[PDB]
Paper text:
The human norovirus genome is a single-stranded, plus-sensed RNA with 3 open reading frames (ORFs), including an ORF2 [name] (viral protein 1, VP1) composed of shell and protruding (P) domains. Expression of VP1 in insect and mammalian systems leads to self-assembly of 90 VP1 dimers into icosahedral virus-like particles (VLPs) that are antigenically indistinguishable from virions (Baric et al., 2002, Green et al., 1993, Jiang et al., 1995, Prasad et al., 1999). Human norovirus attaches to the cell surface via binding to histoblood group antigens (HBGAs; typically A, B, O, or Lewis antigens) on mucosal surfaces of the gut (Lindesmith et al., 2003, Tan and Jiang, 2011). Extensive studies have established that antibodies that block norovirus VLP binding to HBGAs strongly correlate with protective immunity in chimpanzees and humans (Atmar et al., 2011, Bok et al., 2011, Malm et al., 2014, Reeck et al., 2010).
To gain insight into the molecular mechanisms underlying cross-reactive, non-blockade activity, we selected the pan-reactive antibody [name] for crystallographic analysis. Each Fab bound at the interface between monomers in the P2002 dimer, with the heavy chain recognizing both protomers and the light chain recognizing only a single protomer. [name] recognized a region of P2002 which was mostly conserved across genogroups GI and [name], thus explaining the broad cross-reactivity of antibody [name]. Overall, each Fab buried ∼950 Å2 by establishing polar contacts and favorable van der Waals interactions with P2002. Modeling revealed that the conserved region recognized by [name] was located at an occluded site on the norovirus capsid, at the interface between the P domain and shell domain. Overlay of Fab [name] onto the GI.1 capsid structure indicated that other P domains on the assembled norovirus capsid would clash with both heavy and light chains of the Fab, with only minor clashes with the shell domains, suggesting that structural rearrangements of the P domain could either expose the [name] binding site or allow binding at a neighboring P domain. Antibodies like [name] with broad cross-genogroup binding have not yet been shown to neutralize or block VLP binding to HBGAs. These antibodies likely bind to occluded epitopes available for antibody access during phases of particle assembly and/or disassembly, intermediates, or rearrangements.
Author numbering:
A (entry chain L), F (entry chain D): 1 to 211
B (entry chain A), D (entry chain B): 225 to 530
C (entry chain H), E (entry chain C): 1 to 52, 52A, 53 to 82, 82A, 82B, 82C, 83 to 100, 100A, ...
Write the structure that this text describes.
C-alpha cells in the first residue's frame, strides 16, 4: 500500500492568488501521479496526469510538477470556479491509492446575509409536526450565529442547520436553520423569531412572525 | 516489474514500417525534416501510438473488395479490417492500423479468391500513397494493376506489399519520401490523432535509426527506411508494459562474448532512441551484439560519446 | 461524445448482494482499463477494483477481495460490478472510470472519463418515502425584485433524493440544501428557488421529488397564501 | 522463473510457416498422413527446431544472385545468407532457416537492385518446391518468371512470397501439399536434422492447428495452412526459455471479459498442442479470447472435452 | 568431426593467476552454452562456470565467484577461463564442455562434447624433472619414471609403434612429496635383441624427453 | 544447490547381468537429469540426456527413466567395456551439480597373476637409492597380497603399490609393488623376494633374485 499525503488538508485564498498543493508518497511512484478536482455531488475531473501533463479542456492556470516521492499541484491564478476538493492519485502500482484530499475555498469581500423566515405549512400541521425555517442567503464569510426565540425563549436542541457548498460563481454561502416542534407546542406560542449575527451586520437582525 | 528489451541482434529484428528485416543502425541530424512516423510507435510502458499494431506481416497490407475503373487498369478498393469486417472510420486513429506512413509508390500483388468456387487470381499492382485517391481514413484507396477485366466485384481481395518504385524520369532517389506523411483523408481534411513528431532535445544528441533497405521494383527509388523502434520492441513493450521509473532508459549495446560495451544510448519513454554523436554515421557493430537495459536515468543524462 | 452511464445500486441489508452496471458510449470499453472508485459519505476517494484492457485480468482492494467481482460484456459494451456479503463499510457512492490510454492489461495513466455515480446503501433500516411540504413565498421571503420559495422534503430514508422544479424547466436559482440527519434517524432537506416577484401571480411553481428507494414521486405546487 | 504464453488473440498472431496472420483454430484426425513441419518448431524451454528462425518476414524468402537458363523463362538462384554473406551447407540444419516446409508452387516477386547505379527491377516468379531444382540445402534453387532478359547476374536478388498456385486442368485443391516435406537436397540425398514428426499418443486426443488461409494467385489451390505454434509463441519461448516442470503444460482458452474458460488443451514440451476431441472441427471462439498457462500436469492428464 | 582442443596448463603458487583456452572445431562455439567442469585428484566432478549461447550471460560457482572469469571469442571460435587468486582447492583437471542444444542463454540439455582436459596445479613448490631407469628382463620389461612433480607424465613405447599389452601405472605420492610410476610391457621371450625397446617418457612441466632403451644382460 | 545422491556408491556384476543405478534429487528437477560414464584418465561421455533419451552413438543396452526426484540408469546386458565411473547430473538449476559417482566393475572367472621381479638399475644406485619392483600381471579378482622379504625379513612401511583400473576387455587388473631402499641398505643384503598370495594360486608364489 503506497500512502499519499497531501498538504495542506484545507486552504482559503483570494481570486488571482497562487495556490500550491503538495503530495508526498511513501515510496517512489516515478511520474505516475494524477490530480483530480471534485465538486460536491459530482464525479471527479482529471486535471493533471503523469505529474505534469495538462488534461484537455482544463485551463492553463493548472500545472503540476515533481517525480519520485514529491509532487505539486499549482493554480497560478485562483478562480471562483476552482472551489472544491482536490485529490492526488498514484497509478504506479496496485492497489491504486488516493491522497486524503484538500479542501480549497475562496476568500472575498464581506457580504451580509438576506434573512427570510418561513412558517410551517397548514399541510404539515395536520401530520402533527411543525417545521419553522430560517434562510440565510448569499453571504460571506461562512461563520454565522442563528438563534431561535419562541416567545422570547432561546431554543436549544430542536434546530438543525445546513450550509450550502461555496458558490462557484460568487463564492458566497447559504444556510438554512430548521426549528422543529410538535403541533401542540407550535400552537401554544405566538411569536417565532430568528436572530442572525454576521460580520456583514452592524447589529444582530431579527426576522419574525405571529402565528 | 522490471523493464527489459528483448535479447535480439539487429539483423534478427524486423522493421516496424515495412515487413522486412532490419539491417543496420544509423544516426544523423534530422533538422531539415519532420520525423513523424506513425508505424513503430509505442511507449516503453506499453501504449501503442499512431497507426502501430502488433503484426509485422500486416504492415502496408490492404484487404477489401474492388471495383474496376472504366477504361483504365485501375481498381478502387473499399477497405476492410484484417478479419474482413467493415472498416470503421470513426475510430480515433489516423488511419487503419498498419497503413503506410510515407509518401511513395508501393508495389506488390493483388490476390483474389472467388468464394463460390474457390477460383483464384493474382496480379502485380501499385498503390500511390501521395495520390489524391489514397484515402484510407475514408476507407478507400486505388491500385494500378496489370489487368483490366480479371478482378471480380464483391470478392475478398488482398494486397501484399513487396517493394517501392520510382519514375526514372525524375531525379534519382526522389521517391519515396520516408519522412513525409501521406494525407490519410486525401483532400477532404487534415490528418488526425497522429503520434507526435520526435527530435533530440538534449544538445549533442541525435536520433538513432533502425535501418532497412526496401526492395526496389522499378526505376531508381530511395530504398532507405528508418524506424524509431524495431517491431519486436513494440511487441515486447506491449506485452510487458513495465513501469518507467524515469522518462529515459539507459541502454548499453553489448558484445555477448565478453560483456564489453560498444556504446550506450537513451531509450525515451515515449518510444525512440538517441545517441551522443554529431554528423551522419553508419554504426559499425559486431553481428552478435544487442541492446541491454541497465538503469533508468535522469532525463538530462549525458551519454558517453558514441 | 464519450460517455459512461451507470445503473443499478439501491439499498440492501447487511450480507445481501447488489449489481452495478456502467454502459459506455463513444468508445469501445474492452480496449481501455476500467476502474471502480467509491466514496463513503463525507469521506475521500477509495479504489475498489479495476479490469485491464483487451487482455483483461482483474484487480481488487483487500477490503473487497472475494466479495466483489468486476467483469464486462463486449457485446453490450458494458462494465459490471457484482457485490456480495455487503457490509456497512461498503455504503458509498460508486463511480466507474476509464483510463486515458489503451493497454493490454492494467496501465499507468489517469482516469479521464467518469460515470455520474451510483448510490449504494447497506443498512438494516427500512425504507421511508419523504413528506413534501411547500415553503410559500411571502413578504417575509422577498428581497429586491426577487422572492424566495421552496419545498421541505422531510422524513425519508435513505439518501439520496432528487429535486427538480417545474419538471426540470426551471434550473436557474435553485439551492437544494444538503440533507441533515434528524434525531429520528431520518433525513430531511430543503429546496429553495429564487424567482422574480412579478412572476408570482402568473407563473406556477412545482417541485418534483423523486425517491427511488421507495418508488415515491411527489409533485407539489408552491403558492403564496 | 515462471513459464508463460503471450497474451495475444489468434487473429493478432502470425502463422509460422508463411508470412501471413493466423485466422482460426482447427482440430482433426491426422493418422492418414505425417505431420512434420520444419518451420514453427520450438520447445517450450526455448530450443529452436527444424528450419525455424525468429523473424516472420523471412519465412519462404530467398536472397542471392540469379542466372538465366537458356531457352526458358527460368532463373537459377545461388543462395546467400539473410545478410548477403556466403551460405554454408555444412551447418547441421535441414536447409537455410525459413525455407518452405511444404511441397507446392509458391508465387511471389523477384526484385533486384543494381549495385552500381541503383537501378531496380521486379517480376512475378514462382518456385516449385516439389521439383528437382529445389535444392536449398545445397545452396541453389530455380525460379520460373515472367521475364527472359531483364534480370542481371552478380546482383542482389530477393524473392518475396505472396501466395500459392494450382493448375485448373487438374483436380481442384490438389496442390499445394502442406504436410509433404520437400527434399531439401533434391535427389542427391535424404533430408537431415529434421524436427521430429508429431502425433497424439494419448487416447481421445487430436492435434490443435493454428490455421491461416494462404492467398491464391492462379487456379484452385488448397489454401489451408496449419502450424503447430504461432510465430509469436516461438519468439517468446526462445527469449524466455523457462524450464519445463513436466512434459505437458495445461493451457486454458479464456474470455478476458469474464475469465470464463472455453476449452483446455495440452502444450507439449516439444512444442505442439493437443485437444480432447474426435473428428474435424472448426473451433468457434470469441475474437478477444487467448491462451493462458495455468499449470504443469502429468503426461497422462486427461483433458476435458473441448 | 566435432571436437574441443584445450590448452593452457601449468602450475602457480597461491594468489597467482592462470589462463585456460578451449579451441573448437566443427561447430560455432558462440551458438552453444559452454561450461567449465573440474575434477580434483581422485574426486568427483564439479561445475565451475558456464556461458550462455548466442546471447551470452555468465554463471559461476559460489566457490569461484569474483575470482574466475569465463568468456569467449567468436572471431577465433575459442572459449576462455581466466583464473586469478588461486588456492589449493582449485587444483584439479579442468574440462570444457558443450551443451547439446542451441539456446539464447543457458539451457537445460546435457553436455555432449568434451575437451581432453587440462591439468591445473596450485602449489608453492617448484618443478622437478623425472629420472628414468630401465626395468630389464612370456617376457617382461619396463621403465621406472621416478622423481617428478607435478603430474602428468606421458609414456609411450617406441613412440607408439608398439603399445600392445602395455601397462602404465597410476602415479604414487612418495613420502618425499614427489610422484613416481612404472610402465611395463609384455613381449615374447624371443623378441630377441632385435626389437629395440625405447620408452618415450614426457614431463612438460619442465620440458623433458627421455629416449631410454631397455637392454637385458 | 540441488544435491544429487546416487546409489550404490559402487557395484560389481558379471557380463550379461542387468545393472541398475538410481539417482535421488534434493528437490524436483523435472526431466533435466543426464548420465555420463567416465573411463580413467578420459573426459566423461554423455549416455542419457533428458532422463530417458539415448545419446547418439551410445549402445542400445543403456536406458534411463524417472522424473522429478528419482531417476534410474539401467544397463540391460553388462559388457566388459562398460567398466568405469558413472555420474548423474542435473541441468535444471544453477548451480549445475553432479552425483558422487558410481564405480562399476566387472566380474569374471578367476585368473592367477603372472609375477615378475625387477632389480634396481645401475644408474639408480648412483643416486643413493634403489627401487625393487614386483609386477603382478593380468589377474582377477583385484584382491591380492604382496609381501616383501629381504633375507627372510618381512618388510613394512617402505613399499608402495599401485593398481591399474580394471582393463575393459579381459576385465583383469595389474599390480606393481615398489620396494624403496637406500643404496647402503640394498647392497647390505643379498636375497630379494616377492611373495604373492592370490585366490587364483593354490600356494603363495615367490619371485626372487640374488644381488
Amino acid at each position: 500500500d503506497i500512502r499519499l499525503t497531501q498538504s495542506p488538508s484545507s486552504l482559503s485564498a483570494s481570486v488571482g492568488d497562487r495556490v500550491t498543493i503538495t503530495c508526498r508518497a511513501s515510496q517512489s511512484i516515478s511520474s505516475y501521479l494524477n490530480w483530480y478536482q471534485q465538486k460536491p455531488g459530482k464525479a471527479p475531473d482529471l486535471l493533471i496526469y503523469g505529474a505534469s501533463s495538462l488534461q484537455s479542456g482544463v485551463p492553463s492556470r493548472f500545472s503540476g510538477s515533481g517525480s519520485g516521492t514529491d509532487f505539486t499541484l499549482t493554480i497560478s491564478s485562483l478562480q471562483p470556479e476552482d472551489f472544491g476538493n482536490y485529490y492526488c492519485q498514484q497509478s504506479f502500482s496496485t492497489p491504486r491509492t488516493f491522497g486524503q484530499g484538500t479542501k480549497v475555498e475562496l476568500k472575498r469581500t464581506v457580504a451580509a446575509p438576506s434573512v427570510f423566515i418561513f412558517p410551517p405549512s397548514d399541510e404539515q400541521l395536520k401530520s402533527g409536526t411543525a417545521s419553522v425555517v430560517c434562510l440565510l442567503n448569499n453571504f460571506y464569510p461562512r461563520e454565522a450565529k442563528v438563534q431561535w426565540k419562541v416567545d422570547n425563549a432561546l431554543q436549544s436542541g430542536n434546530s438543525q442547520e445546513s450550509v450550502t457548498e461555496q458558490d462557484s460563481k460568487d463564492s458566497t454561502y447559504s444556510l438554512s436553520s430548521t426549528l422543529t416542534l410538535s403541533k401542540a407546542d407550535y400552537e401554544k406560542h405566538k411569536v417565532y423569531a430568528c436572530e442572525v449575527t454576521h460580520q456583514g451586520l452592524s447589529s444582530p437582525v431579527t426576522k419574525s412572525f405571529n402565528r | 516489474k522490471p523493464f527489459t528489451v528483448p535479447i535480439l541482434t539487429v539483423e534478427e529484428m524486423t522493421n516496424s514500417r515495412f515487413p522486412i528485416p532490419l539491417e543496420k543502425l544509423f544516426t544523423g541530424p534530422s533538422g531539415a525534416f519532420v520525423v513523424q512516423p506513425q508505424n513503430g510507435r509505442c511507449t516503453t510502458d506499453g501504449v501503442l501510438l499512431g497507426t502501430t499494431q502488433l503484426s509485422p506481416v500486416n504492415i502496408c497490407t490492404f484487404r477489401g473488395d474492388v471495383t474496376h475503373i472504366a477504361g483504365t487498369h485501375n481498381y478502387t478498393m473499399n477497405l476492410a479490417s484484417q478479419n474482413w469486417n467493415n472498416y470503421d472510420p470513426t475510430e480515433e486513429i489516423p488511419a487503419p492500423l498498419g497503413t503506410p506512413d510515407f509518401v511513395g509508390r508501393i508495389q506488390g500483388m493483388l490476390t483474389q479468391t472467388t468464394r463460390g468456387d474457390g477460383s483464384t487470381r493474382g496480379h502485380k499492382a501499385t498503390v500511390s500513397t501521395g495520390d489524391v485517391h489514397f484515402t484510407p481514413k475514408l476507407g478507400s484507396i486505388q491500385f494500378n494493376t496489370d489487368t483490366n477485366n480479371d478482378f471480380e466485384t464483391g470478392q475478398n481481395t488482398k494486397f501484399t506489399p513487396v517493394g517501392v518504385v520510382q519514375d526514372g524520369n525524375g531525379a534519382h532517389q526522389n521517391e519515396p519520401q520516408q519522412w513525409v506523411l501521406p494525407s490519410y483523408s486525401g483532400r477532404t481534411g487534415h490528418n488526425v490523432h497522429l503520434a507526435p513528431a520526435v527530435a533530440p532535445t538534449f544538445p549533442g544528441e541525435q536520433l538513432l535509426f533502425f535501418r532497412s533497405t526496401m526492395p526496389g521494383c522499378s526505376g531508381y527509388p530511395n530504398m532507405n527506411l528508418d524506424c524509431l523502434l524495431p517491431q519486436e520492441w513494440v511487441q515486447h513493450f506491449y506485452q510487458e508494459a513495465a513501469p518507467a521509473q524515469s522518462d529515459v532508459a539507459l541502454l548499453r549495446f553489448v558484445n555477448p562474448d565478453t560483456g564489453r560495451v560498444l556504446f550506450e544510448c537513451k531509450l525515451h519513454k515515449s518510444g525512440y532512441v538517441t545517441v551522443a554523436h554529431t554528423g551522419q554515421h553508419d554504426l559499425v557493430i559486431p553481428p552478435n551484439g544487442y541492446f541491454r537495459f541497465d538503469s533508468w536515468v535522469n532525463q538530462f543524462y549525458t551519454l558517453a560519446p558514441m | 461524445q464519450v460517455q459512461l452511464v451507470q445503473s443499478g445500486g439501491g439499498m440492501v441489508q447487511p450480507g445481501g448482494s447488489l449489481s452495478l452496471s456502467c454502459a459506455a458510449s463513444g468508445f469501445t470499453l474492452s480496449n481501455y482499463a476500467m476502474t471502480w472508485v467509491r466514496q463513503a459519505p463525507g469521506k475521500g476517494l477509495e479504489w475498489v477494483s479495476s479490469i485491464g484492457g483487451s487482455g483483461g485480468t482483474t484487480y481488487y482492494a483487500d477490503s473487497v477481495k472475494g466479495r466483489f467481482t468486476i467483469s464486462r460484456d463486449s457485446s453490450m459494451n458494458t462494465l459490471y460490478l457484482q457485490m456480495s456479503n455487503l457490509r456497512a463499510g461498503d455504503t458509498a457512492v460508486y463511480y466507474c472510470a476509464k483510463d486515458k490510454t489503451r493497454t493490454l492489461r492494467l496501465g499507468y495513466s489517469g482516469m479521464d472519463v467518469w460515470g455520474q455515480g451510483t448510490t449504494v446503501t447497506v443498512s438494516s433500516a427500512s425504507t421511508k418515502g419523504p413528506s413534501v411540504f411547500p415553503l410559500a413565498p411571502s413578504s417575509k421571503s422577498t428581497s429586491g425584485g426577487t422572492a424566495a420559495l421552496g419545498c421541505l422534503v422531510k422524513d425519508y430514508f435513505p439518501e439520496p433524493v432528487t429535486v427538480s422544479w417545474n419538471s426540470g424547466a426551471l434550473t436557474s436559482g435553485v439551492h437544494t440544501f444538503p440533507a441533515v440527519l434528524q434525531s429520528s434517524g431520518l433525513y430531511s432537506l430543503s429546496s429553495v428557488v429564487t424567482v422574480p416577484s412579478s412572476s408570482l401571480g402568473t407563473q406556477t411553481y412545482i417541485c418534483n421529488v423523486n425517491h427511488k428507494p421507495s418508488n415515491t414521486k411527489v409533485d407539489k405546487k408552491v403558492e403564496p397564501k
